[model samples]
Target: ASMTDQQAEARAFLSEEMIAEFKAAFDMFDADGGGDISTKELGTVMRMLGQNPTKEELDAIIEEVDEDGSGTIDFEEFLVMMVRQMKEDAKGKSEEELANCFRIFDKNADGFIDIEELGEILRATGEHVTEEDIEDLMKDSDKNNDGRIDFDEFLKMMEGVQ
Candidate 1:
């Protein structure tokens, strides 16, 4: 089967209010609104957040999500990558569509996404997630209230939001 409505809804969780906040954050990375963030800008954010990606390391990252190769990043590409990562960080399947979320969130290359690591992931994808939104999603992902999400828990939360 194709992705369920629930799966689609899961994708939609990125809201406008959230988008505005994220856009503000993104502006920080794209300091001059040149529509692209450089390896220096990106590397600093990653290293500062302990994501450990160097300027050279970030080249692959930029290449993977750049979409248009304009030597800069933009919002649409950024959003696509993050939502893709969120699904993977939740640890569901190897679906390529889910790559963006996993790629962004797996900062240390450990495969699992800890709640605190989200900001770094956001930066890599051209997003500017705030402390508040990150906190909210991390808390919300635990559907059973057991702290942390297993794949099943992730699917449940993913249900019907599309």
Candidate 2:
């Protein structure tokens, strides 16, 4: 019970494709054949991958994974970074999409959406939604019994579904 659901999702995030890709990249970056990636080797790898990074700048990244202060990225540390990076990509894109969805939902610039507005919006979908639906939806998103959906409340609603 102490383990988080988010960590569970992160573990499931690494599929065969991700494992294969990261292994290939890790081997490619281990330029010195030392079974590890040093800061200099990583810089060269990024350069070959069409990135332009400075020396000490790359050193800073190595320092972050240098849990033992070794400044070398072995398979374990590389896997850790890959998991974090992949999770970031997934969450960052979804949050960006939700923020944009909020902009469309709050068309009146009031930062709060009403049941009428939600009903009007839903009915645009050819009556797949009804008054009762939006009424209950409003209640779900209406924190504090305000009869309106605060952005925070709306955010919570979608995130809970998410």
Candidate 3:
């Protein structure tokens, strides 16, 4: 299945080691040979991940990511949980850190990301976004309709991503 932009960006934010850990944790909790993690299983996952969260915390996490309200967290919902955590962690980042991250996709250092740059980023992240996808992303993100994504515009786009 194709990842949402937020899902891709959330993945980009994690280190390779963190990704491994998340996968391990998810696998550990999916005990029934099923792809979903039940609320009770999530408590175990949380503990294994070193959170030692209270029951209430586990419930809150489930409530936040259980999109189908099936009382289970599937892979997509799992990604949403990880993305929410990434967004929370990002709140403490400095402007310099944010700018540095933005620069990763702004290949030309022109202080903005154009269509080609966006395409490269999407591809690098394992997403084969079509030209139509690029167009839609720009239409939604480029509030000024200036044909490029400036740093401010990028931040604005990310604000609603979580």
Q: Pick the candidate with the highest TM-score.
A: 2
Poorly placed runs, candidate 2 (over 4 Å): 1-12, 40-61, 67-69
User: Local error of candidate 2 at 78, Å?
Assistant: 0.7
Give residue 29's error in model 2 in angstroms. 2.1
CA deviation > 4 Å runs, candidate 3: 1-3, 52-57, 86-162
Better of 1 and 3 by lDDT: 3
Which digits, one per residue and each the tens of the lDDT, describe model 3 over residues 1-162? Answer: 334765676677778798777877797767786777786677666556544455666678877667577778776556556656545545556555777889888988989999998887876777677889878988889988889999899887776652
Estimate the TM-score for candidate 1: 0.37
Find the candidate with the highest lDDT and give its number. Answer: 3
Could you tell me every candidate's TM-score relative to the true structure?
Answer: 0.37, 0.72, 0.42
User: How far does residue 50 in candidate 1 sit from its true spot (Å)?
Assistant: 12
Note the Cα lDDT for every prediction shown: 0.56, 0.68, 0.73
Q: Among all windows of ten consecutive residues in candidate 2, which has the lowest summed lDDT? A: 1-10
